[PDB]
Write a protein that binds this ligand. Structure first.
Ligand SMILES: C[C@H](CCC(=O)NCCC[N+](C)(C)CCCS(=O)(=O)[O-])[C@H]1CC[C@H]2[C@@H]3[C@H](O)C[C@@H]4C[C@H](O)CC[C@]4(C)[C@H]3C[C@H](O)[C@]12C
Ligand SMILES: *C/C=C(C)/C=C/C=C(C)/C=C/C1=C(C)CCCC1(C)C
Ligand SMILES: CCCCCCCCCCCCCC
Ligand SMILES: CCCCCCCCCCCC
Ligand SMILES: CCCCCCCCCC
Ligand SMILES: CCCCCCCCCC
Ligand SMILES: CCCCCCCCCC
Ligand SMILES: CCCCCCCCCC
Ligand SMILES: CCCCCCCCCC
Ligand SMILES: CCCCCCCC
Ligand SMILES: CCCCCCCC
Ligand SMILES: CCCCCCCC
Length: 225
């Protein structure tokens, strides 16, 4: 009965509801293009749902020693992020008709970001944990850079309806994403200042906003047709 279970349960419910909702709305639409967005967008919270349910039931948590103590690390988060973050980027890539190579680089960078983040989370030498964290954050900044400069520019060539929608989704992604590394740094994976129960609350808020919130904005717009 870990203190943060209440947030894992709240996260489970929200990802679950969002999943079903997007799924229903998705299966009713007939437009080929919109169907693509709905599929990608529905899968995201569907995966988050399964990982959150897993954590709620006691999986994806391991004790890692560093700083002279045993620290609880939820590695299941990375299993979630490994697949969801690139799908979210895919959504944006499709919305602005980004080039194949740009997509590859983004997903690749994303892989580096999640992968190094996990190694960092499992590293036993306190100082090295932050080396991986920095490597990971740098990869994240490359992603946000391309989204902000590269994608926005690509968006300008689209109709104002698509560009505007992209901008909202872009802003939401930059704000929420730029926060993860800060939570990691001050939470149980980093300095251990914010306790795991509040940290789980923070990630849940960021996760729901970045997936279901993102989905609601995207799937409710005409930019997907
Ligand atoms: C029965 C299994 C395995 C036991 C070995 C254990 C492992 C994780 C446990 C849940 C979590 O602790 C979260 C939450 C805490 C509440 O307090 C009571 C309810 C709940 C849903 C727990 C129920 C049950 O206890 C679980 C499923
Ligand atoms: C639904 C989940 C989303 C949109 C998660 C996004 C997660 C990130 C942008 C995570 C970034 C991290 C770093 C930059 C470094 C430290 C470790 C991570 C994996 C928390
Ligand atoms: C030989 C050890 C080298 C360590 C380099 C660490 C770089 C850390 C950057 C983040 C620091 C966060 C402090 C809270
Ligand atoms: C004390 C009992 C808490 C039960 C919390 C349930 C949260 C949603 C679970 C959904 C499983 C599909
Ligand atoms: C995908 C091409 C650009 C890759 C940038 C990688 C940055 C890694 C920092 C650790
Ligand atoms: C792909 C780039 C990998 C960089 C690894 C750095 C490890 C530092 C350990 C102290
Ligand atoms: C690119 C190769 C990076 C190798 C890192 C090795 C780290 C060893 C820590 C004990
Ligand atoms: C021993 C002092 C190490 C300071 C590292 C600063 C790294 C800045 C870029 C992450
Ligand atoms: C002990 C300090 C190790 C620093 C490794 C930096 C790797 C940077 C890869 C981009
Ligand atoms: C066209 C709707 C696709 C839905 C895929 C859902 C996967 C959970
Ligand atoms: C992918 C690099 C992993 C390094 C692990 C080092 C464990 C001492
Ligand atoms: C948003 C930062 C919260 C910090 C809580 C610290 C409790 C010791």
């Amino acid at each position: 009965g870990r203190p943060e279970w209440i947030w894992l349960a709240l996260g489970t419910a929200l990802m679950g509801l969002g999943t079903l909702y997007f799924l229903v709305k998705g299966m009713g639409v007939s437009d080929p293009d919109a169907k693509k967005f709905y599929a990608i967008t529905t899968l995201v919270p569907a995966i988050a749902f399964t990982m959150y349910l897993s954590m709620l039931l006691g999986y994806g948590l391991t004790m890692v020693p560093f700083g002279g103590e045993q620290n609880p690390i939820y590695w299941a988060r990375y299993a979630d992020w490994l697949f969801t973050t690139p799908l979210l980027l895919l959504d944006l890539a499709l919305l602005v008709d980004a080039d194949q190579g740009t997509i590859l680089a983004l997903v690749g960078a994303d892989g580096i970001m999640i992968g190094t983040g996990l190694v960092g989370a499992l590293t036993k030498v306190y100082s090295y944990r932050f080396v991986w964290w920095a490597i990971s954050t740098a990869a994240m900044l490359y992603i946000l850079y391309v989204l902000f400069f590269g994608f926005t520019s690509k968006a300008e060539s689209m109709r104002p309806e698509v560009a505007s929608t992209f901008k909202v989704l872009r802003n939401v992604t930059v704000v929420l994403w730029s926060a993860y590394p800060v939570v990691w740094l001050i939470g149980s994976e980093g300095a251990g200042i914010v306790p795991l129960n509040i940290e789980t609350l923070l990630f849940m808020v960021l996760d729901v906003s970045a997936k279901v919130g993102f989905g609601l904005i995207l799937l409710r717009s005409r930019a997907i047709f």
